[model samples]
Target: RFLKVKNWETDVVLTDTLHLKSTLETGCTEHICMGSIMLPVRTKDQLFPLAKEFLDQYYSSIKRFGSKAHMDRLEEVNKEIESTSTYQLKDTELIYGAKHAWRNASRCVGRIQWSKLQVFDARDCTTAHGMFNYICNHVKYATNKGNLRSAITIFPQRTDGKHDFRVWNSQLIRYAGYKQPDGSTLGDPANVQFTEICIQQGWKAPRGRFDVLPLLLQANGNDPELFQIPPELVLEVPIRHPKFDWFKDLGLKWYGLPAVSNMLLEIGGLEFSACPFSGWYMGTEIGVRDYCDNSRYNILEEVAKKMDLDMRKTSSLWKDQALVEINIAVLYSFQSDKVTIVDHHSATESFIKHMENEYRCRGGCPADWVWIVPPMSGSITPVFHQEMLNYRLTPSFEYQPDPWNTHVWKG
Candidate 1:
């Protein structure tokens, strides 16, 4: 059938049935989705146009819904846009973008209060020292003496022909994993490479398994600088069982805040590579995945041994029982310390509330069911039964390559 005149860019290749059968014989379907495609945006021409478009749309939306006083300020913003070829977003714009990004973050179950995010504008930071200071303050504030609050401290955005700021560590607070002579990892396995990077950059690695990793920050073409976090500032929960006295002997502990540092903060098409954001901890994030995963602490067997479970029987459900207790211990420990942590069930419940609110406001909400459902008791969670779709939304937080991978830091 002939279609309307939309010019085609290239001739479509018709699939040959025999060729398809030949390709299938090699069992190629499993490997087809394994690779990634990354496009470059090294120049301002490629970056600024997208930034401008996002800023324009954001400004228009504000004008339509905001009060007359806010509209007056938006007019000034429009004037500023007309005056400068490069769209320099105001602090207000950045704040709006930060909260919007959280709201649009498909993986987060705590987006019910996305509008309550505290934005610390660190765009003025030009040196590693300044970045360190802002980060320290962010940690203290977000930690809030165990009452953790969601916050993001935004660094400078990427611009044309200028060196960008970057946070090398994956999180503001992380345990260093040292690979021993026996090939066993001491602390968090996820941070072994990052810990080595910090040690190479002249920071001392503590011998303890739960030693907090130092902040490695690079600003504007300068060499990366290591900033040690003050011990008093970091709030950590020492895990203990509610009923079992022997569980306290394990000496398991984790930082109160789950502040992700490596993700790029994209607002109005501009990327801020060093915007570190923190959220309250979900118990299973620490208990089930961080502590129980085989690549991580792999503590299921250890806990099962302590519980006197029958480890020899595969059908004994020892692992499942140990995981449930570990999760309970995490939740109990945080509450005992007056630190805020949501259990998986409550977190999922909160997520559905967020979905309903987002639907009422935006017509639809973007979510990934795999992430929203907790690792333990997943079948019982509301999110497990709900269907979800993942689609890209701009003005969002996104995962980016490690800082060392880019030439700006490597050089």
Candidate 2:
């Protein structure tokens, strides 16, 4: 009565000759799949789809060297996966994996430079000190003296399904948020929770608003170790307007690199929980989300008043006008400092081009329209008009639970 099949919408009937008198009414919904015990792959029916994607990516990338040999290796990997229900990638494969993960990342609009990603293999690292050293190196190289490079440094994967190596900080470079006496947060509000955690963990919290939090590195099942990033290695751009000389007095600044430290890198069913990846910031990310979000800096009112804009009525469009100018300042400041940054307009255009390239190469591109479109000028960008498809794709980068929440069970 059991069969290996795909069933999202279907009905099965069985009639016994002996007339089994039983009142049995069964209905299947969207969540039910006809199968034996499912694998741990998300979306129970999505096992072979991920495998197919992984093999396709491997072949596409490796075919240039030698088609037949690569096919043989691919077959071996496939066979191994089928037999053991798992697969392992070597260093070269992992390097390409990281690059392709960026390419497959739906939320990232900067996939044009995905293949240019610099991957650091740190799978052999088993100590927090080793991870700290690698992270420092990653920061220095990615910063690249303002010409930032998209990079990811991967640590060990969960082989035996035990605890994972993790970076506690959300990003490599983030300003510390200190609560002022009047109950307002001073620095990046997004980091306030993390800043408190760091302080409780024995880090000396600085009184300044723009203090950089120390990197907290933890090997699997080990206590976290704090590592302060060297100030010289961190390239920062002091925010200023192109015309408004007084805008510099706000003392606003941000790091050149937006290296995310807590995202999990999933490649071929394996999980690298400690991988950190980064792309150069698009101006609106800083100007809007970091500085303008209500839970964040919430500076639109302050900025509007500074520009002498009428903040009395909604018709004044004070926030909108202030947002545009702030974004302009962000772009101008980074360019003046020679730091690699992108404007939302150019970024969307590049994203459209990336989609075209991906279509030719992979037949289709998966993109999240909400993220692909710029925060400020959505209607003007080409991506705003085009319909986009977003679906789960394997060998991708994923946001994982915060390390502070994921309790490490010590054996």
Clashing residue pairs, backbone N/CA/C < 3 A, model 1? none
Model 2 agreement with the true structure over 50-167: per-residue lDDT tens digits: 5555666677666644477666766777677667666667777898789877877767888888889889999889899999999999999999999998888999886544557899
Q: How close to the true structure is residue 48 of candidate 2, measured as C-alpha lDDT?
A: 47
Cα RMSD, each candidate: 9.1, 10.1
| Per-candidate local distance difference test | 0.78, 0.78
Any residue pairs clashing in model 2, and if so which? none
User: Which residue window of length 10 is worst by lDDT in model 1?
Assistant: 15-24
- Model 2 stretches with alpha carbons more than 4 Å out: 1-53, 64-87, 180-182, 409-411
- Please tell me which predicted candidate would have the highest TM-score against the true structure: 1
Tens digits of per-residue lDDT, candidate 1, 55-131, equal 55566667644556555655654565456534567787888899888977777888898989999999889999999
Root-mean-square deviation of Cα positions for candidate 2 versus the true structure, in angstroms:
10.1
